[PDB]
Amino acid sequence: ANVVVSNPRPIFTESRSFKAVANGKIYIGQIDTDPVNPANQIPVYIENEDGSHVQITQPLIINAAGKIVYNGQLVKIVTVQGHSMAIYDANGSQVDYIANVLKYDPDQYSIEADKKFKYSVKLSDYPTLQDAASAAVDGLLIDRDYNFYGGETVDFGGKVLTIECK
Amino acid sequence: ANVVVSNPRPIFTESRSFKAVANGKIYIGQIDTDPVNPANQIPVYIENEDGSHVQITQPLIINAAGKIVYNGQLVKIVTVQGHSMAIYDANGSQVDYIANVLKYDPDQYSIEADKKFKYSVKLSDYPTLQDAASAAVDGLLIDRDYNFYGGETVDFGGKVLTIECKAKFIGDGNLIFTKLGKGSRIAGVFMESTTTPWVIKPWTDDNQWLTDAAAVVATLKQSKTDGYQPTVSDYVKFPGIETLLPPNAKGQNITSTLEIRECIGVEVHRASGLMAGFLFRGCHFCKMVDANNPSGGKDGIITFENLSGDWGKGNYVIGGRTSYGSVSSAQ
Amino acid sequence: TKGDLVRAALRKLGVASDATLTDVEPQSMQDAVDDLEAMMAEWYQDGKGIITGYVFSDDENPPAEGDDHGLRSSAVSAVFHNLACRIAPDYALEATAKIIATAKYGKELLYKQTAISRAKRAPYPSRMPTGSGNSFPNLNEWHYFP
Amino acid sequence: TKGDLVRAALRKLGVASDATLTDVEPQSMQDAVDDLEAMMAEWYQDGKGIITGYVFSDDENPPAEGDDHGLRSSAVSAVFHNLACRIAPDYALEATAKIIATAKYGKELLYKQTAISRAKRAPYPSRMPTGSGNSFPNLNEWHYFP
Numbered sequence: 001a002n003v004v005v006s007n008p009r010p011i012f013t014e015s016r017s018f019k020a021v022a023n024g025k026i027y028i029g030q031i032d033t034d035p036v037n038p039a040n041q042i043p044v045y046i047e048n049e050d051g052s053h054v055q056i057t058q059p060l061i062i063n064a065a066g067k068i069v070y071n072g073q074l075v076k077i078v079t080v081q082g083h084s085m086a087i088y089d090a091n092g093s094q095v096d097y098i099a100n101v102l103k104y105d106p107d108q109y110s111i112e113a114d115k116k117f118k119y120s121v122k123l124s125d126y127p128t129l130q131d132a133a134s135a136a137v138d139g140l141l142i143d144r145d146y147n148f149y150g151g152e153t154v155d156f157g158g159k160v161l162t163i164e165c166k
Numbered sequence: 167a168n169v170v171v172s173n174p175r176p177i178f179t180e181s182r183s184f185k186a187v188a189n190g191k192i193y194i195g196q197i198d199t200d201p202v203n204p205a206n207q208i209p210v211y212i213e214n215e216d217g218s219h220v221q222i223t224q225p226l227i228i229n230a231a232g233k234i235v236y237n238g239q240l241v242k243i244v245t246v247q248g249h250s251m252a253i254y255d256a257n258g259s260q261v262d263y264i265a266n267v268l269k270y271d272p273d274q275y276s277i278e279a280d281k282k283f284k285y286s287v288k289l290s291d292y293p294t295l296q297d298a299a300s301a302a303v304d305g306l307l308i309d310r311d312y313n314f315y316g317g318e319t320v321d322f323g324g325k326v327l328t329i330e331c332k333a334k335f336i337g338d339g340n341l342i343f344t345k346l347g348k349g350s351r352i353a354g355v356f357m358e359s360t361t362t363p364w365v366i367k368p369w370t371d372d373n374q375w376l377t378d379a380a381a382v383v384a385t386l387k388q389s390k391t392d393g394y395q396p397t398v399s400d401y402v403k404f405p406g407i408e409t410l411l412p413p414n415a416k417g418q419n420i421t422s423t424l425e426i427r428e429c430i431g432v433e434v435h436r437a438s439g440l441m442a443g444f445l446f447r448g449c450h451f452c453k454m455v456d457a458n459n460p461s462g463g464k465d466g467i468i469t470f471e472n473l474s475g476d477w478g479k480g481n482y483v484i485g486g487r488t489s490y491g492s493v494s495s496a497q
Numbered sequence: 498t499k500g501d502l503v504r505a506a507l508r509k510l511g512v513a514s515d516a517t518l519t520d521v522e523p524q525s526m527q528d529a530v531d532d533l534e535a536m537m538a539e540w541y542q543d544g545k546g547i548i549t550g551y552v553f554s555d556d557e558n559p560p561a562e563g564d565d566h567g568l569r570s571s572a573v574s575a576v577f578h579n580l581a582c583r584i585a586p587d588y589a590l591e592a593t594a595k596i597i598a599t600a601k602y603g604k605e606l607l608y609k610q611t612a613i614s615r616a617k618r619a620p621y622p623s624r625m626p627t628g629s630g631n632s633f634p635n636l637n638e639w640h641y642f643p
Numbered sequence: 644t645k646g647d648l649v650r651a652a653l654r655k656l657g658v659a660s661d662a663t664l665t666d667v668e669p670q671s672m673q674d675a676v677d678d679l680e681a682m683m684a685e686w687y688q689d690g691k692g693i694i695t696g697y698v699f700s701d702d703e704n705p706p707a708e709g710d711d712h713g714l715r716s717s718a719v720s721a722v723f724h725n726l727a728c729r730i731a732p733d734y735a736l737e738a739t740a741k742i743i744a745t746a747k748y749g750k751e752l753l754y755k756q757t758a759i760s761r762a763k764r765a766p767y768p769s770r771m772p773t774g775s776g777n778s779f780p781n782l783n784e785w786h787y788f789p
Contacts (some may be wrong), residue, residue, distance in 0.1 A: 004270035006176040018186035078167040089498035118286030185563025189527035573681035
């Protein structure tokens with residue numbers, strides 16, 4: 001859509017020189033508070049595009065490309081809330097502090113799309129009402145005509161359905 | 167989890183070199199226009215470390231690392247709208263031109279599904295009803311039972327939400343719904359208690375009456391229908407019934423109650439349940455619309471309690487019917 | 498942190514730490530680099546000035562920060578004392594005796610090898626004898642080789 | 644507090660101890676470390692700059708303090724005392740007389756052994772006769788002196 005990140009691939013550099021942060025640490029924690037404190041600091045998860053979340057240690061390691069790395073590979077790190085990011089270099093000096101990091105990006109989109117959307121099947125996407133009946137898990141929509149004969153039975157499988165006929 | 171890590175400070179490099187832009191000027195403007203002209207310029211905001219926003223002029227100074235900087239310190243520069251961005255270096259050469267910054271990564275319907283499909287949340291995908299209620303911005307679907315206890319408060323965030331209950335709410339005490347806006351609907355609701363309370367039947371099989379105390383005690387059973395729980399009024403009505411009844415069948419408070427507390431426009435449609443009650447506390451302009459055969463408990467099926475809050479007005483029973491109850495069905 | 502100096506950006510923040518600041522982030526975002534480029538035309542007059550390995554930067558597409566320098570690792574220890582004195586008037590101050598001395602001493606070292614090679618006598622005139630102490634005297638005048 | 648001179652990270656708090664600070668941690672970051680790296684870059688050329696001997700950073704966790712000492716002995720009394728004088732203007736102060744004297748006299752004894760290796764007088768040219776006081780030289784004249 002219209003949503004895009006500032007850095008197409010996350011990369012962290014020194015404040016007044018364009019050179020990657022080497023052997024840096026990133027502390028991820030609650031918004032508008034220092035993530036240095038363990039109390040504010042939150043656990044970070046690797047978001048697998050499969051639809052799995054696994055838990056890893058709270059600090060993120062910065063390689064020599066200035067990119068996030070965990071388990072010797074480029075990872076996609078997510079949190080369960082809006083977070084603050086604090087970039088620290090190898091001398092432990094604070095390069096940059098970002099109080100607010102929030103994004104809507106649903107990628108994976110197996111787990112996400114169940115919770116953020118409603119489901120109604122349209123009769124136009126099936127050739128028969130029987131197929132659209134078994135494919136209705138919540139909503140059912142009748143947007144076109146259906147022929148029927150004496151003694152034609154349609155089964156919904158015991159599912160509770162809100163049917164809308166237009 | 168879904169909040170992907172990012173740095174709000176964009177990386178700047180030259181068009182034909184890897185050298186980072188420095189001592190530049192950045193003009194922010196309207197969608198698909200040149201931001202350089204003052205006519206197309208739009209307010210640039212700084213997102214502070216208190217989460218507040220202060221308005222600044224469109225020119226942004228670029229540090230020697232190719233990142234955004236303003237006030238001489240590292241800050242987050244945000245906008246409240248889509249915008250055009252023109253990146254310039256110190257020599258006045260135009261590094262980039264972005265016609266509309268918020269236009270980027272389009273295609274692949276997963277991202278673009280936000281603007282063209284109805285939102286709803288599902289109770290199975292959130293740990294609790296508290297989480298599912300506050301995460302509901304449109305629909306709320308109850309696809310599993312929710313265990314509740316008295317004093318359980320579910321915050322809906324002050325939003326108009328259509329709660330479509332295709333599953334029960336199990337528990338005893340008050341399941342408290344707060345902050346539901348005007349025009350909110352609760353439809354298909356069912357309320358069932360976890361325990362099965364004792365009930366007495368003071369009628370025959372021809373649906374008359376039993377006026378003998380021992381005969382009412384003889385029909386004593388644990389059920390949620392074909393009788394209602396022993397009332398204090400029943401003790402006066404049938405003399406000596408109380409002594410005959412066991413202690414466990416007396417003093418009962420077993421009702422599964424959905425309480426709408428201090429909301430307006432919340433109308434409970436298709437109210438059903440076994441040992442069910444609906445208590446509207448402090449509410450005004452809230453109706454019970456077409457209740458379909460509920461069975462009452464110690465708490466009334468239709469209860470308007472305006473003892474807390476101001477005097478009730480607009481609290482109506484329009485259509486529907488009720489059955490059983492150990493107290494007044496409409497009170 | 499700072500790695501290898503592949504940019505005048507790393508030089509600039511170190512120069513600001515020498516002149517005024519006590520090893521903290523500078524307000525500069527292009528200041529010392531402008532003085533560096535102007536000093537490296539007085540030095541390295543197309544290799545006829547002070548040779549530091551410098552190569553010119555266009556400063557069109559180069560922003561004049563990440564700009565070309567090509568300076569030696571040896572030449573780093575000189576320049577940041579010279580540039581420290583150059584941004585000293587900019588703050589309405591004047592550099593101390595340590596900075597100006599090392600600035601000249603660093604400039605001296607960079608030109609040292611150049612001054613050694615260019616300080617050499619020219620060949621013997623074309624009027625030196627062929628020599629009869631050199632066998633088979635023939636040549637009139639001299640070769641002008643040695 | 645004054646640290647050991649084994650590595651640049653631990654060296655740094657002892658450099659600042661000389662110049663200004665007394666029992667205070669250095670507010671020097673990586674800015675003063677790179678100045679020491681380039682100090683022994685020019686000096687690590689060993690054709691011009693005075694031979695110190697040094698081991699350069701291979702990146703430990705800090706990229707510029709990943710180094711180790713390669714120092715001779717007179718270089719031990721030279722390099723960090725010189726660095727202390729360079730970081731004294733950072734705090735807008737000038738180093739005391741003991742620090743400047745030690746760094747000089749440390750650099751002075753360091754070039755003492757270096758000078759003998761590099762510089763030696765050239766022998767006789769090749770206009771040189773063998774000499775007739777020679778007894779069986781087995782040559783008449785010489786290619787140079789030998």
